[PDB]
Write an enzyme that holds these catalytic residues in place. Structure first.
Site, PDB file in Angstrom:
ATOM      1  N   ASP A 189      66.355 190.538  93.903  1.00 38.65           N
ATOM      2  CA  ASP A 189      66.607 190.902  95.292  1.00 38.65           C
ATOM      3  C   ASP A 189      68.019 190.514  95.704  1.00 38.65           C
ATOM      4  O   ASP A 189      68.582 191.078  96.639  1.00 38.65           O
ATOM      5  CB  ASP A 189      65.596 190.207  96.202  1.00 38.65           C
ATOM      6  CG  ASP A 189      64.171 190.525  95.823  1.00 38.65           C
ATOM      7  OD1 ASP A 189      63.974 191.179  94.776  1.00 38.65           O
ATOM      8  OD2 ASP A 189      63.251 190.125  96.567  1.00 38.65           O
ATOM      9  N   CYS A 221      68.383 204.474  93.098  1.00 40.08           N
ATOM     10  CA  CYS A 221      67.897 203.151  93.465  1.00 40.08           C
ATOM     11  C   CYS A 221      67.452 203.225  94.923  1.00 40.08           C
ATOM     12  O   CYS A 221      66.610 204.068  95.243  1.00 40.08           O
ATOM     13  CB  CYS A 221      68.977 202.090  93.218  1.00 40.08           C
ATOM     14  SG  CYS A 221      70.657 202.490  93.763  1.00 40.08           S
ATOM     15  N   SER A 222      67.977 202.384  95.815  1.00 43.46           N
ATOM     16  CA  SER A 222      67.678 202.593  97.231  1.00 43.46           C
ATOM     17  C   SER A 222      68.705 203.516  97.883  1.00 43.46           C
ATOM     18  O   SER A 222      68.349 204.528  98.469  1.00 43.46           O
ATOM     19  CB  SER A 222      67.638 201.268  98.004  1.00 43.46           C
ATOM     20  OG  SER A 222      67.220 201.523  99.342  1.00 43.46           O
ATOM     21  N   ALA A 223      69.981 203.164  97.777  1.00 42.73           N
ATOM     22  CA  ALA A 223      71.049 204.009  98.313  1.00 42.73           C
ATOM     23  C   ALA A 223      71.514 205.055  97.292  1.00 42.73           C
ATOM     24  O   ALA A 223      72.147 206.055  97.646  1.00 42.73           O
ATOM     25  CB  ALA A 223      72.245 203.148  98.741  1.00 42.73           C
ATOM     26  N   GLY A 224      71.219 204.818  96.020  1.00 38.37           N
ATOM     27  CA  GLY A 224      71.694 205.738  94.999  1.00 38.37           C
ATOM     28  C   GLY A 224      73.166 205.563  94.690  1.00 38.37           C
ATOM     29  O   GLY A 224      73.820 206.510  94.264  1.00 38.37           O
ATOM     30  N   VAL A 225      73.705 204.363  94.891  1.00 35.52           N
ATOM     31  CA  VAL A 225      75.100 204.126  94.509  1.00 35.52           C
ATOM     32  C   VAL A 225      75.365 202.900  93.631  1.00 35.52           C
ATOM     33  O   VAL A 225      76.171 202.967  92.696  1.00 35.52           O
ATOM     34  CB  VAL A 225      75.999 204.043  95.758  1.00 35.52           C
ATOM     35  CG1 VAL A 225      75.830 205.311  96.572  1.00 35.52           C
ATOM     36  CG2 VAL A 225      75.651 202.810  96.591  1.00 35.52           C
ATOM     37  N   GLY A 226      74.699 201.786  93.920  1.00 37.37           N
ATOM     38  CA  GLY A 226      75.016 200.543  93.225  1.00 37.37           C
ATOM     39  C   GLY A 226      74.421 200.439  91.829  1.00 37.37           C
ATOM     40  O   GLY A 226      75.112 200.559  90.816  1.00 37.37           O
ATOM     41  N   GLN A 265      78.689 199.335  93.132  1.00 39.42           N
ATOM     42  CA  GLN A 265      78.935 199.031  94.532  1.00 39.42           C
ATOM     43  C   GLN A 265      79.621 197.681  94.667  1.00 39.42           C
ATOM     44  O   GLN A 265      80.399 197.468  95.585  1.00 39.42           O
ATOM     45  CB  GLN A 265      77.604 199.044  95.302  1.00 39.42           C
ATOM     46  CG  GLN A 265      77.718 198.757  96.785  1.00 39.42           C
ATOM     47  CD  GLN A 265      76.466 199.160  97.554  1.00 39.42           C
ATOM     48  OE1 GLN A 265      76.547 199.600  98.700  1.00 39.42           O
ATOM     49  NE2 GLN A 265      75.305 199.016  96.923  1.00 39.42           N
TER      50      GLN A 265
HETATM   51  O1  VO4 Z   1      69.995 200.797  95.630  1.00 40.32           O
HETATM   52  V1  VO4 Z   1      71.550 200.648  95.312  1.00 40.32           V
HETATM   53  O2  VO4 Z   1      71.578 199.908  93.909  1.00 40.32           O
HETATM   54  O3  VO4 Z   1      72.555 201.848  95.575  1.00 40.32           O
HETATM   55  O4  VO4 Z   1      72.141 199.534  96.606  1.00 40.32           O
END
Ligand code: VO4
Length: 283
Positions: A189, A221-226, A265
């Site tokens: 987390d 992932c959640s945002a699709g960037v990190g 990210q």
């Molecule tokens: O869910 V992310 O790994 O883009 O923050």
């Protein structure tokens, strides 16, 4: 572009760590600024009819590389999904990087998968992390679920220590296709995983699952960037190493940054990319 041999890369790594990782930090600062002189439009992302389709108001999909859904009769923005094509090693649009689906975009998500002929989903988030919602559950817990014209059926599940693999059949009622979801479940987390080896295995297994010739591998992932960007660079650089025994992390990363905002990210993730490649190179 400027690829360097594995042996040189391996000395270059130690230099990046050395003075407190001042090198890594300077590299990543360079990535952050690489698009600063690039105004990349995201008009569809910012359109009012589309606002509810974005998990995060500040995480957009650039226009030139966004995945478009076929328009639905009846609206004028039904082609929109927060998702961009991203290149991989020696292949354009090897991936689709997208956010964790919202209940309100479940239909768009699965329709996109159908239309792009995607056979592999890579999910690198838990549904909820540290009490916070990160992704909605867009697949059936058991048996079958309907998402618009697409019915998805869970065929089987294997739960490893660090990741879960779900086999689905999906069918367009206008079951026809196999879709394999590789779900990494041990991203902490806070921060990055402590050991790269499990991530490495995940990448190798999920990358090997890619059949000729399906559509792009969907990674979210959640945002699709990190974590998504980190997966993409690691997978692409393992490809290049196996193919030409060279590597160009910084070059590749600056390239894909034009294709979706914020890929890889954080500096910890940028460093973890190197931990992973080194383990693959040494192991
Ligand atoms: O869910 V992310 O790994 O883009 O923050």
């Amino acid at each position: 572009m400027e690829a360097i041999p594995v042996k040189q890369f391996v000395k270059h790594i130690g230099e990046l760590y050395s003075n407190n990782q001042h090198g890594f930090s300077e590299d990543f600062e360079e990535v952050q600024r690489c698009t600063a002189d690039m105004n990349i439009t995201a008009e569809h992302s910012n359109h009012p009819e589309n606002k509810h389709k974005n998990r995060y108001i500040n995480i957009l999909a650039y226009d030139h590389s966004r995945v478009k859904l076929r328009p639905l009769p009846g609206s004028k923005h039904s082609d929109y999904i927060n998702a961009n094509y991203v290149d991989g090693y020696n292949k354009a649009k090897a991936y689709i990087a997208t956010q964790g689906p919202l209940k309100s975009t479940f239909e768009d998500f699965w329709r996109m998968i159908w239309e792009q002929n995607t056979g592999i989903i890579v999910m690198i988030t838990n549904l909820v992390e540290k009490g916070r919602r990160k992704c909605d559950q867009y697949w059936p817990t058991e048996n079958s679920e309907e998402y618009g014209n697409i019915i998805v059926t869970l065929k089987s599940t294997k739960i490893h220590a660090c990741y879960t693999v779900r086999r689905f059949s999906i069918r367009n009622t206008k079951n026809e296709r196999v879709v394999i979801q590789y779900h990494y479940t041990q991203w902490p987390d806070m921060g990055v995983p402590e050991y790269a080896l499990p991530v490495l295995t995940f990448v190798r297994r999920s990358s090997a699952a890619r059949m000729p010739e399906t559509g792009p591998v969907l990674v979210h992932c959640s945002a699709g960037v990190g974590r998504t960007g980190t997966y993409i660079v690691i997978d692409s650089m393992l490809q290049q190493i196996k193919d030409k025994s060279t590597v160009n992390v910084l070059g590749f990363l600056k390239h894909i940054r034009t294709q979706r905002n914020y890929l890889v990210q954080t500096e910890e993730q940028y460093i973890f990319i190197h931990d992973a490649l080194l383990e693959a190179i040494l192991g």
